[PDB]
């Protein structure tokens, strides 16, 4: 589940369950990672 | 009369609807 969600899958291809069979609400096996979106900056300081 | 009813002394046959819903589950 971390795997899948470094990759940046956004599963709305396969579209969403309109009625309660199966809508995906479960406590899972993979649970819900929410990997962060840790930002690394590019800047200049002494012309480097 | 059951035969009859069924389309659209013999009693008062009931003869329920049936409820289908055509189901998207994962774009199947």
Sequence with gaps: ??????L???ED???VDMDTDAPQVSHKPGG???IK???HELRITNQV
């Design 1 to 6: 589940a971390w795997t899948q969600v470094l």
């Design 8 to 10: 940046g899958q956004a």
């Design 13 to 15: 291809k396969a579209e």
């Design 32 to 34: 819900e990672p929410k």
């Design 37 to 39: 979106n840790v930002v």
